[PDB]
Amino acid sequence: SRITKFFQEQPLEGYTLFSHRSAPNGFKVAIVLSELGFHYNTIFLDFNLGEHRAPEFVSVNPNARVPALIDHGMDNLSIWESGAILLHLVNKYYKETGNPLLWSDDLADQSQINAWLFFQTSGHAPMIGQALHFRYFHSQKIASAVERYTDEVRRVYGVVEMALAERREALVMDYPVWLVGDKLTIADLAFVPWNNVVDRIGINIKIEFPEVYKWTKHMMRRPAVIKALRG
Amino acid sequence: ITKFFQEQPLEGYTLFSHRSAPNGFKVAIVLSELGFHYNTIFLDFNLGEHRAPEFVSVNPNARVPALIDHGMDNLSIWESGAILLHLVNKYYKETGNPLLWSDDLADQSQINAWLFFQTSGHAPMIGQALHFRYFHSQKIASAVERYTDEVRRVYGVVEMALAERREALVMFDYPVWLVGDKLTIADLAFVPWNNVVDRIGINIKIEFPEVYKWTKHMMRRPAVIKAL
Ligand SMILES: N[C@@H](CCC(=O)N[C@@H](CSCc1ccc([N+](=O)[O-])cc1)C(=O)NCC(=O)O)C(=O)O
Ligand SMILES: N[C@@H](CCC(=O)N[C@@H](CSCc1ccc([N+](=O)[O-])cc1)C(=O)NCC(=O)O)C(=O)O
């Protein structure tokens, strides 16, 4: 019913973010939302109560997962999939102000930003999730599965590390380094919520990925980021 | 390979893929539908070409597909999702026609939603399902069930979306699409993977009728046939 009444009286403006206090993809969206100055409220869904199975929610997000965002100012447009939401945001912020904050107005740069973005949503997140699953939630213990995904997650972090190290190397010919166009974009941010959980599968970023550590730290010091991870 | 790079083309595209990568063919399909002239370089994992230095420069993730937009000073683009967004975007900027795309930000977010859904929730699960059924060191039914079920849940979502679309259309043999009653990279991104799920015991024809029709319409497209 909680979800019901809300869809009975939705704000004519602003944004509503459906998330979960455990969903990194949710906090990922909160961060961007916060960095762009977008005012919004969060509705943490109780999966225990099966609220994510509520008809009103499946309408918003047919995949019945989080995050899902509602752009009220746009006739209550519903955007699901964190990657889709990030793009909708940087695009909307750009057409409105003329400044491609956390984005780019150059086609080539966007292709670069998207690459890291899809890589994060397609190869980073799913893997951390499969690792966590066998390590902690499977119906039985399967060391080989845990090792498969743990390795993979290490492999993907190696690509990011190597990339960051490469960017640093280039500028030499603890200064902050970024994935695309020497500027903070949604590319860098997408990884932040996750970097904070991989410890749970035995990965020690600070130690095994020095570049990723500095990187995450620079981002962890931004007001908007802190605000999001607290809300 | 090494040669190719020092003797790279001035215009067009070069698609690095693999005979078994649905991801790669997804790009070829879009490349074709958009009329972009391109050549494909199939990497044999045997010789470990995808591990080679020059390729990693194109794709740090050392995976296929990767794409070189020669007209843009050999711009390197990796991750099938990003490559698709790059193509529709470039096509639109050049002709002022959102083919397989859209000029409405609302429609774009929906297309992007289905696109991310396909690349982050469809392909990864199919791939895991394949691994545990055919290539894992040990045979484990629980792992296989985990992924086959999830893939079946994903299709259900799509099947439902399409069914709701057919529902509306009827107010009756016509094609139905995910977004804007028009074919887009959102519909196309599932095509190659659709033709692969049978390898994990899923019969689309019987289990997902609307997905069967939908797939059929795309499979009958000439641009699609060629690419494949
Ligand atoms: N591709 C979608 C994936 C969304 C997704 O995986 N959502 C998960 C939460 S993030 C996965 C996750 C949850 C918790 C942790 N953790 O460390 O505690 C890590 C990852 C969910 O809704 N789960 C509810 C359910 O199905 O029951 C996107 O990026 O938006
Ligand atoms: N998120 C990336 C994922 C790319 C990816 O997974 N690439 C795979 C090939 S498609 C994976 C695949 C192969 C075969 C089937 N099949 O059904 O036969 C399905 C999927 C690769 O390069 N693999 C190198 C390797 O083998 O190490 C993207 O969307 O582009």
List every span in chain B annotated with CATH 1.20.1050.10: 96-227
Q: Which residue lies with its CA nearest to atom 25 of ligand 1? A: A65
Query: What residues contact residue B182 under an 8 Å CB cut-off, 6+ apart?
Result: B102
Cα angle vertex B70, ends B67, B73, to 5°?
Answer: 115
Query: Best residue in A93, A114, A138 to probe B by mutation, most B CBs within 10 Å?
Result: A114
Q: How far is B198 from chain A (nearest CA, A)?
A: 22
State how far the Cα of A141 lies from the Cα of A156, in Å rounded to an integer. 24
DSSP state string for B146-204: HHHHHHHHHHHHHHHHHHHHHHHH--------SSTTS--HHHHTTHHHHTTGGGGT--H
Strands B66-69 and B13-17: antiparallel
Is A115–B79 a contact, with Cβ atoms under 8 angstroms apart?
Answer: yes
Spell out which residues of chain B touch residue A162, defining contact as CB-CB under 8 Å.
60
| Structure-token pair, residue B28 | 């070829």
Question: Is A23 close to ligand 1, i.e. is its CB under 6 Å away?
Answer: yes
As a CATH number, domain B1-95 is: 3.40.30.10
CA B90 to chain centre: 18
A47 lines ligand 1 (CB under 6 A): yes
CA distances from residue A57 to A30, A79, B109, B210 in whole angstroms, order as listed: 19, 12, 17, 23
Tokens representing A58 are 């499946």
Locate A104 and state its tokens.
Answer: 């780019």
* CA B204 to the chain's CA centroid: 18
3-state secondary structure of A201: helix
Burial label, B173 (beta-carbon count in 10 A; 0-12, 13-18, 19+):
exposed
Q: Does the Cβ of B98 fall within 6 Å of ligand 2?
A: no
Nearest-atom index, ligand 2, CA of B78? 30
8 Å CB contact between B66 and B59: yes
Contact, A79 vs A88, CB < 8 A?
yes
CA A172 / ligand 1 centre spacing (Å): 39
Does ligand 1 have an atom closer than 6 angstroms to the CB of A109? no
Residue B148 CB partners (closer than 8 Å, separation 6+)? B129, B133, B200, B201, B202
Q: Are B227 and B34 in contact (CB under 8 A)?
A: no
Start-end of CATH 1.20.1050.10 domains in chain A: 98-230
A88 chain-B contacts, CB cut-off 8 A: 105, 108-109, 112
φ and ψ at residue A42, rounded to 5 degrees: -110, 140
Residue B167 C-alpha, separation from nearest chain A C-alpha, in angstroms = 15
Task: Please report, as a single letter, which amino acid is at residue A64.
Answer: A
Identity of the residue numbered A72: H
CATH 3.40.30.10 placement within chain A? 1-97
Record: contact B140-A138, CB cut-off 8 A: no
For residues B200 and B126, is the Cβ–Cβ distance under 8 A? Answer: yes
In chain B, count of helices (H) and strands (E)? Answer: 12, 4
Is B94 in contact with B48 (CB distance < 8 Å)?
Answer: no
Which residue has 């490559």 as its token pair? B83
Q: What is the CATH number of domain A1-97?
A: 3.40.30.10
Q: How many C-beta neighbours within 10 Å does residue A218 have?
A: 17
DSSP state of B51: G
Q: Roughly what angle, to the nearest 10 degrees, separates helices B80-95 and B22-33?
A: 0
State whether the Cα torsion A90-A92-A93-A96 is positive or negative. positive
Question: CATH 3.40.30.10 region(s) of chain B?
Answer: 1-95
Residues in chain B: 228
**Residue B43 DSSP label:** P
DSSP string of A90-134, one letter each residue: HHHHHHHHS--TTS-SSHHHHHHHHHHHHHIIIIIHHHHHHHHII
- A98-230 maps to CATH 1.10.3720.10: no
Residue B37 three-state SS: coil
Q: In what order do the strands lie in the sheet with B75-78?
A: B38-42, B13-17, B66-69, B75-78
> Does residue A88 contact residue A40 with C-beta atoms inside 8 Å?
no
Instruction: Measure B21 CA to ligand 2 centroid, in angstroms.
Output: 5
With beta carbons less than 8 A apart as the criterion, state whether A125 and A194 touch: yes
- Please give the number of the atom of ligand 1 that sits closest to the Cα of B121: 1
What CATH number was assigned to the domain covering residues B96-227? 1.20.1050.10
DSSP conformational letter for B136:
-
CB contact under 8 A, B79 and A163: no
Q: What is the DSSP letter of B5?
A: H
Per-residue DSSP letter, A73: G
Record: contact A62-B106, CB cut-off 8 A: no
Residues 6+ apart with CB under 8 A from A67: A17, A18, A19, A23, A25, A26, A28, A29, A80, A82, A85
Give Cα A59 distance to the centre of its chain: 22
Ligand 2 mean position, distance from CA B66 (Å): 12
